[PDB]
């Protein structure tokens, strides 16, 4: 019987404060690097109020991910467990989760991806990028968040950008997100108030949709709200939790990824040159054909863009680790994971590994003309039965945004900045950039 080595830290809190200490997002951070150096890639700790096995071992992390529902299961801390609702897909397990995942996969199907969703992705890209003024200075992080929130609101509830009900859902949504990152104080009871308001807003739009469906109007299931009403048997409270958890799942991730790409690309002008060549050829082809909107076949031509995307996610690491629990005693590589203990697969660790990538701290999208996303080396979307249901939409959002960005603008940092993990990734100075339109 061999328990992994490590400390236990302070009572109640353990090593949580040190574990959560902000660190530059392109690294693992002092706490993680030092613990791996002293104890190895598998070590024990006391985190988020529970005894914990931390894993920076890519072989163990894929074993955990693939054995969801058998040896391990998703398990958030008590505080974080319930802010997205009892029926949040990110927290559910068992049959209910299997049913909610099947719904998300079907709504995000390839057929719907290449017709419905792509049109909205390009429309929302141009809604943002056409408002950018010459020689202006602004926060790219805020613009990225604008793009992805607008886009998600369209996808889930057919809301249009810039309209009042959408700008007000943003303020309510961010006030609610100030609860996840937290006495409770007046900034936690405020987040529960906002959550209730949001749930009442979603239930309002749900009743309007049930009327559209009863009156047999066409294309009622273009958004997620209409889709679950027509194609599922979820209850009202289940629908509200699904809508809210999808907004979070799709916006918090995609916004960071877009911002990371803007950041990495201004420091890699040769990658922007190759992107312009690839995207100018696509645009020239459509001009000769007299076609205006992008189609799936144009997206399939964005080979080097997919290299930038993979490199952005490998180096930037939108998600630092996952929250899991062991369902029974497990033995792996000679260590014992006791039942009921928390298990944290640090899926970001292998992305920064010297032995799996050559110069992992360098942004080098050309490495993906040799490497591949299959296997242990690459898991920014997770793995196993909970592998990210929106990954294909995420890549499409980045590709379409990049396409119009490099065709319309040059950009530079107006103020020094760097990404940090809190563990959520964010730019402290807001990623201010100056832009100028091309010829």
Annotated binding residues for heme, written as ranges, equal 388
Q: Does 149 bind Cl ion (CB under 5 A)?
A: no
Token pair of 189 as six digits:
């009871």
Closest CA to 259 of 318, 339, 327, 347: 318
Q: Does 390 bind ligand HEM (CB under 6 A)?
A: yes
Q: In angstroms, give the least distance from the CB of 439 to ligand HEM.
A: 32
Q: Does 394 bind ligand HEM (CB under 6 A)?
A: yes
User: Binding residues for Cl ion, how many (CB under 5 A)?
Assistant: 3
Instruction: Choose, by CB under 6 A, the member of 199, 380, 400, 425 that binds ligand HEM.
Output: 380
Q: Does 381 bind ligand HEM (CB under 6 A)?
A: yes
Residues sharing a CB contact under 8 Å with residue 13, sequence separation 6 or more, in sequence order: 49
Edge-to-edge strands, sheet with 324-326: 42-47, 50-55, 342-345, 324-326, 72-74
Burial category of 369 from C-beta neighbours within 10 Å (exposed 0-12, middle 13-18, buried 19 and up): exposed
Stretch that binds ligand HEM, among 36-44, 78-86, 311-319, 410-418 (CB under 6 A): 311-319
Q: Does 157 bind ligand HEM (CB under 6 A)?
A: no
Instruction: Choose, by CB under 6 A, the member of 4, 14, 29, 382 that binds ligand HEM.
Output: 382
Q: Which residues, numbered 62-101, are part of the site for ligand HEM (CB under 6 A)?
A: 74, 89-90, 101
**Dist. CA 308–CA 403, nearest whole Å:** 12
Q: In angstroms, give the least distance from the CB of 142 to Cl ion.
A: 33
Token pair of 294 as six digits:
């992008």
Q: Which residues, numbered 357-376, are part of the site for Cl ion (CB under 5 A)?
A: 357-358, 367
**Dist. CA 427–CA 379, nearest whole Å:** 23
**Dist. CA 222–CA 112, nearest whole Å:** 9
Strand 409-413 relative to strand 42-47: parallel, antiparallel, unpaired?
Answer: unpaired
Ranges assigned E (strand) in 218-328: 324-326
Is the Cβ of residue 263 or residue 363 nearer to Cl ion in the bound state? 363
List the Cα angle 175/178/180 in 5-degree steps.
Answer: 130
In this structure, the number of other CB atoms found within 10 A of the CB of residue 62 comes to: 18
Q: Which does 101 bind (CB under 5 to 8 A by kind): ligand HEM, Cl ion, none?
A: ligand HEM
| CA trace torsion 192, 196, 198, 203 (10° rounding) | 160
Is the Cβ of residue 28 or residue 257 nearer to ligand HEM in the bound state? 257
List the Cα angle 226/154/117 in 5-degree steps.
Answer: 85
Is the Cβ of residue 323 or residue 404 nearer to ligand HEM in the bound state? 323
**Dist. CA 63–CA 292, nearest whole Å:** 46
Element housing 43 (H / E): strand 42-47
Q: Which does 190 bind (CB under 5 to 8 A by kind): ligand HEM, Cl ion, none?
A: none
Q: Does 419 bind ligand HEM (CB under 6 A)?
A: no
Stretch that binds Cl ion, among 13-21, 49-57, 280-288, 355-363 (CB under 5 A): 355-363
Is the Cβ of residue 36 or residue 346 nearer to ligand HEM in the bound state? 346
Is the Cβ of residue 323 or residue 351 nearer to Cl ion in the bound state? 351
b (16+ CB within 10 A) / e for 39-56: bebbbbbbbbebbbbbbb
Q: In angstroms, give the least distance from the CB of 382 to ligand HEM.
A: 3
Contact code string over 208-247 relative to ligand HEM, x by CB under 6 A = --------------------------------------x-
Token pair of 409 as six digits:
């603008």
Q: Which does 358 bind (CB under 5 to 8 A by kind): ligand HEM, Cl ion, none?
A: Cl ion
> Which residues lie near Cl ion (CB under 5 A)?
357-358, 367
Residues that bind ligand HEM (CB under 6 A): 74, 89-90, 101, 104, 246, 249-250, 253-254, 257, 313, 318-319, 322, 380-382, 386, 388-390, 393-394
């Amino acid at each position: 019987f061999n328990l992994p080595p490590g400390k236990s830290g302070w009572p109640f809190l353990g090593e949580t404060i040190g574990y959560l200490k902000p660190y530059t997002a392109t690294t693992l951070g002092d706490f993680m690097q030092q613990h791996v150096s002293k104890y190895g890639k598998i070590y024990r700790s006391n985190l988020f109020g529970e005894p914990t096995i931390v894993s920076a071992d890519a072989g163990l992390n894929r074993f955990i991910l693939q054995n969801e529902g058998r040896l391990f299961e998703c398990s958030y801390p008590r505080s974080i467990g319930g802010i997205l609702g009892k029926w949040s897909m990110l927290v559910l397990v068992g049959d209910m989760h299997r049913d909610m995942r099947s719904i998300s996969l079907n709504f995000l199907s390839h057929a719907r991806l290449r017709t419905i969703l792509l049109k909205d992705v390009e429309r929302h890209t141009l809604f943002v990028l056409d408002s950018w003024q010459q020689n202006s200075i602004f926060s790219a992080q805020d613009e990225a968040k604008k793009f992805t929130f607008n886009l998600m609101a369209k996808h889930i509830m057919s809301m249009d950008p810039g309209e009042e009900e959408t700008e007000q859902l943003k303020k309510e949504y961010v006030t609610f997100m100030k609860g996840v990152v937290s006495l409770p104080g007046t900034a936690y009871h405020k987040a529960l108030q906002s959550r209730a308001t949001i749930l009442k807003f979603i239930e309002r739009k749900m009743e309007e949709r049930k009327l559209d469906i009863k009156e047999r109007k066409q294309r009622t299931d273009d958004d997620l709200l209409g889709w679950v009403l027509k194609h599922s048997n979820l209850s009202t409270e289940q629908i509200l939790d699904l809508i809210l958890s999808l907004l979070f799942a799709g916006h918090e991730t995609s916004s960071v990824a877009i911002a990371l790409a803007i950041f990495f690309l201004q420091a890699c002008p040769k990658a922007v040159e190759e992107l312009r060549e690839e995207h100018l050829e696509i645009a020239r082809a459509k001009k000769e054909l007299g076609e205006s909107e992008l189609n799936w076949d144009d997206y399939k031509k964005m080979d080097f863009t997919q290299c930038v995307i993979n490199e952005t996610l490998r180096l930037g690491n939108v998600v630092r680790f996952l929250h899991r629990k062991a369902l029974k005693d497990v033995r792996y590589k000679g260590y014992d994971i006791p039942s009921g203990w928390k298990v944290l697969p640090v899926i970001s660790a292998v992305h920064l590994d010297n032995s799996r990538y050559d110069q992992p701290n360098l942004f080098n999208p050309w490495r993906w003309q040799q490497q591949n996303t299959w296997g242990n080396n690459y898991m920014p979307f997770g793995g196993g039965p909970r592998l990210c249901a929106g990954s294909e939409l995420a890549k499409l959002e980045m590709a379409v945004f990049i396409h119009h960005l490099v065709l319309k603008f040059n950009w530079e940092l107006a103020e020094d900045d760097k990404p940090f993990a809190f563990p959520f990734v964010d730019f402290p100075n807001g990623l201010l950039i100056r832009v100028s339109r091309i010829l």
